[PDB]
Amino acid sequence: EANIFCTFDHKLSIADVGKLTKLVAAVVPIPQRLHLIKHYQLGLHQFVDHTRGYVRLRGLLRNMTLTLMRRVEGNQILLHVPTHGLLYTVLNTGPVTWEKGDALCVLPPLFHGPLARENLLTLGQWELVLPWIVPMPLALEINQRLLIM
Amino acid sequence: GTFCNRLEWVYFLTSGLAAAAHAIKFHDLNKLTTGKMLFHVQVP
Amino acid sequence: MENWSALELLPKVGIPTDFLTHVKTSAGEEMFEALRIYYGDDPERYNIH
Amino acid sequence: MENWSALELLPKVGIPTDFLTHVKTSAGEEMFEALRIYYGDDPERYNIH
Amino acid sequence: TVSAPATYGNFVLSPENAVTAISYHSILADFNSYKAHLTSGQPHLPNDS
């Protein structure tokens, strides 16, 4: 129902669990809203496709469910969907400043320009890509700008 | 009628399947990531 | 990478740390080589592998 | 990527081994992972950092 | 009727195991036996953990 258990087909070393343990209270997208889920559909890596359309990723992401990352313990993830209304905490890696008063939206991430391409999780070919959490005026600005485009 | 009172219990070590096992109780699996055993062998 | 859980958990040595500038002024102006600042109560020290 | 110096240097408990097939076949066909199959004697276990 | 192990294998970490666990994120079981056999020079343990 609420607490959603994910797994891993591959083992995590100390480096992998170390970079996972700094991802607590990060929002990840889940497409299914089911309980015993698997890590390949976790995140946007199954849905990311360059030269396919940013607006497609945008529509599927705003159609996707959202959940919060807390308490890995070794081959376990414990995703927890946030309930509607109650206060939660978030931790964003998207290089955009925030504000105590504004609102947020969730957008597929852009490249900032340094081009790091390392979101601190990779399992073989599979990688983790995190959706950018963007303050509301920048969100409607990029929406209207792609609409003018 | 009466309750289903005829329930019984089973243990691990009473079963012979523990002959395939080496049961070890250790209270920190949640703080454990992997468990490795590494073997060295010279050949004749 | 330096595991700051090892600093947050091991018993340390009591020192009257005295330097002339402010702590944050020495921090953000990068007098040192590696920092680790959390403004709340970071629970990253509590999980051990 | 395991510390093979820690295998060769530390005291090791002896066993009567039993591989089902020949052990070099098991190494060349990957029954396990991270198989250090150096021939002769590699002195790289000696230097300690 | 055969014999059977009456209880589980109660296995616990040493204090220096805990210090290595918090420091370098690793556990080497029966640390004192490793240290004593290393200082003595006997390269074969009686048993493992």
Add this chain to the structure above:
Amino acid sequence: TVSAPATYGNFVLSPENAVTAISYHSILADFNSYKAHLTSGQPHLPNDS
């Protein structure tokens, strides 16, 4: 007339440090005091290594 140290202060490796040196490629200075102060629950060492 000032009182200076007559010789260099010697630093010695503990036998517990040797296993961390071989296995984990690291040295924690004065390992046994860290282990004892961790086991006793005392949070501050009375002196530095």
Add this chain to the structure above:
Amino acid sequence: LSQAGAHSLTPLSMDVIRLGEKTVIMENLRRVYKNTDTKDPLERNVDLT
């Protein structure tokens, strides 16, 4: 030749079979070619035409 050597004797266990008052030691040589490199010469490749 029989005068030369073969002084003392020691007992050891093996297995024998009796065939027409002739006792003959049965033997297998798996332990000499267990994890070795050379092929066992009792394993043979015969060829018909």
